[PDB]
A paper describes a structure:
We have also determined the Espin1-AR/Myo3b-ARB2 complex at a resolution of 2.3 Å. The structure of the complex and the binding mode of Myo3b-ARB2 to Espin1-AR are highly similar to what are observed in the Espin1-AR/Myo3b-ARB1 complex, directly confirming our earlier conclusion that the two repeat sequences in Myo3-THDI bind to Espin1-AR with similar binding mode and affinity. Comparing the structures of Espin1-AR in complex with Myo3b-ARB1 and Myo3b-ARB2, the ‘YY’ motif and the ‘KxL’ motif are essentially in the same places. Despite the high similarity, there are still a few minor differences. First of all, the C-terminal α-helix of ARB2 is shorter. The interaction is mediated by a hydrogen bond between Asp1294 and Tyr144, instead of the more extensive interaction observed in Myo3b-ARB1 complex. Moreover, the positively charged residues in the N-terminus of ARB2 cannot be reliably built, probably due to the high salt concentration in the crystallization buffer (1.6 M ammonium sulfate). Nonetheless, clear electron density can be observed near the negatively charged surface. Indeed, substitutions of these positively charged residues with Ala weakened the binding. Furthermore, the involvement of more positively charged residues of ARB2 may compensate for the less extensive interaction in its shorter C-terminal helix, thus resulting in a similar binding affinity to Espin1-AR as ARB1 does (107 nM for ARB1 vs 53 nM for ARB2, Figure 1C2 and C3).
The THDI mediates binding of Myo3 to its cargo protein Espin1 (Ectoplasmic specialization protein 1) and allows Myo3 to transport Espin1 to the tips of actin bundle-based structures such as filopodia and stereocilia. Espin1 is the longest isoform in the family and contains a stretch of ankyrin repeats (AR) in its N-terminus. Here, we discover that both Myo3a and Myo3b contain two highly similar repeat sequences in their THDI region, each capable of independently binding to Espin1-AR with high affinity. The high resolution crystal structures of each of the two binding sequences from Myo3b in complex with Espin1-AR not only reveal the molecular basis governing the specific interaction between Myo3 and Espin1, but also allow us to discern the Myo3-mediated release of the auto-inhibition mechanism of Espin1.
Residue numbers in the entry:
A (entry chain B): 1288 to 1307
B (entry chain A): 0 to 27, 33 to 331
The structure:
C-alpha cells in the first residue's frame, strides 16, 4: 500500500520557516 | 533585481530602518510572493503594518499557489500579524488558496494551538471546510500530532471525528500512520473515534501503524482499542505483512511474541514472502526463527526465496534457500 498524504509535493509552505 | 532581495530580507529580519529607506527612495519573487509575505512569515508586525498602511502595498496579493500574506502568517504561526491582516489588514478568514486551504487549515497543519484557538473563537473560521483532497483542519492536527489544536477542533466541530479525506483516511488513521500516540489515545478513549473505518485501499489505522513502524501506537491499539492483530486489508494483508514488507523488525517481533499468526494473504503470500520480496533480511530471519513456512508457495507458485531472487535480493535468497536445505 501507499502512505496517505494530505498535500502535494509543493514546497511553498514547508519552505517558509528556515527549514529548507 | 537589487530592490527585491533587500526588501525581502529587511522585511524578514525586522529591519524597519531599511524598509523606510527603500520606500523613501521610491524602490517599493519567483513564487510571486511580496514583502508583505515575508514580514508575515516571521511575525514582524511593525514592518508588515508599515508595508501596508504607509507604503500602500496591498495585503491581498496571492503567490503562485494562491497564498496571501495571511496564509503565510498562519503557516508560520505568528498570531499578531494574522490578526492585523484579518481585522485591519483586509484579509477575510474564509480565503482559500488554490488547493482549498484556508488559514485555519495551515494553522492546524503546522501545529500552532494559539493561532487555531483564536481563529475558532474570535476569528469566525469555519472548521467544517475541506481542501481539495478532502482534509479538514482536524485531519491536519491529528497528522501533525498537535493534541491541543485537535482538542479545540473536536470541541468546535465534533462531527469531524470520523470524517474521511478523499482517499478515506480518518484523523485516527493519520495519527496512527504518523506515530502520534497521545493524539491516538485521545481520539479513541475520549472521542469514540472508530478504529475500523478503512482508507480507500482497505487499510485500517492498525495497518498504517504497522506500515510505518510505530510500535508504541500499534501496541496501544491492539491492547486497549478493540482492534485485533488478525485485521486484514482488502488483500488479506495483516499488520505483520506490512511490518515485514517495510522492514519494521520492532513491530514484527512484538506481533510474533504476543501470538499473531504467520498467515497467507488472499494471494497466498505470507509476511515472509513480503520481507523476502523487499529484501528485508533481518525480517526474513526473525520470521524464519519464528517458524514461518519457508516452502509455502503463493498463487503464482513462488516461495519467499523465489521472490527475493527475482527482485535481486541475493542475501535474502541465499539465507532462505540455505535455511531450507538445512531441514
Amino acid at each position: 500500500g501507499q502512505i496517505k498524504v494530505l498535500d502535494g509535493e509543493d514546497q511553498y509552505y514547508k519552505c517558509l520557516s528556515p527549514g529548507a | 533585481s537589487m530592490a527585491l532581495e533587500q526588501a525581502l530580507q529587511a522585511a524578514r529580519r525586522g529591519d524597519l530602518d531599511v524598509l523606510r529607506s527603500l520606500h523613501a527612495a521610491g524602490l517599493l519573487d519567483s513564487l510571486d510572493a511580496l514583502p508583505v509575505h515575508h514580514a508575515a512569515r516571521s511575525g514582524k508586525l511593525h514592518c508588515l503594518r508599515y508595508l501596508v498602511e504607509e507604503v500602500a502595498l496591498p495585503a491581498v496579493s496571492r503567490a503562485r499557489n494562491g497564498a496571501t500574506p495571511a496564509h503565510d502568517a498562519a503557516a508560520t504561526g505568528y498570531l499578531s500579524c494574522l490578526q492585523w491582516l484579518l481585522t485591519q489588514g483586509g484579509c477575510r478568514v474564509q480565503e482559500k488558496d488554490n488547493s482549498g486551504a484556508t488559514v485555519l487549515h495551515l494553522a492546524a497543519r503546522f501545529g500552532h494551538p494559539d493561532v487555531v484557538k483564536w481563529l475558532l473563537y474570535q476569528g469566525g473560521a469555519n472548521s467544517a471546510i475541506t481542501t481539495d483532497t478532502g482534509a479538514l483542519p482536524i485531519h491536519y492536527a491529528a497528522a501533525k500530532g498537535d493534541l491541543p489544536s485537535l482538542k479545540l477542533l473536536v470541541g468546535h466541530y465534533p462531527e469531524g471525528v470520523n470524517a474521511q479525506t478523499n482517499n478515506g483516511a480518518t484523523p485516527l488513521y493519520l495519527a496512527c500512520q504518523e506515530g502520534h500516540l497521545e493524539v491516538t489515545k485521545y481520539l479513541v478513549q475520549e472521542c469514540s473515534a472508530d478504529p475500523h473505518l478503512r482508507a480507500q485501499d482497505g487499510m485500517t489505522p492498525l495497518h498504517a501503524a504497522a506500515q510505518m513502524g510505530h510500535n508504541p501506537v500499534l501496541v496501544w491499539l491492539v491492547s486497549f482499542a478493540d482492534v485485533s492483530f488478525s485485521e486484514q486489508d482488502h488483500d488479506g494483508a495483516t499488520a505483520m505483512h506490512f511490518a515485514a514488507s517495510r522492514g519494521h523488525t520492532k513491530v514484527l517481533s512484538w506481533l510474533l511474541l504476543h501470538g499473531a499468526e504467520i498467515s497467507q494473504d488472499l494471494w497466498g503470500g505470507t509476511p515472509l514472502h513480503d520481507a523476502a520480496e523487499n529484501g528485508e533480511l533481518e525480517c526474513c530471519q526473525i520470521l524464519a526463527v519464528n517458524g514461518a513456512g519457508l516452502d509455502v508457495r503463493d498463487h503464482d507458485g513462488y516461495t519467499a526465496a523465489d521472490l527475493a531472487e527475482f527482485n535481486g535480493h541475493t542475501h535474502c535468497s541465499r539465507y532462505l534457500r540455505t535455511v531450507q536445505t538445512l531441514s
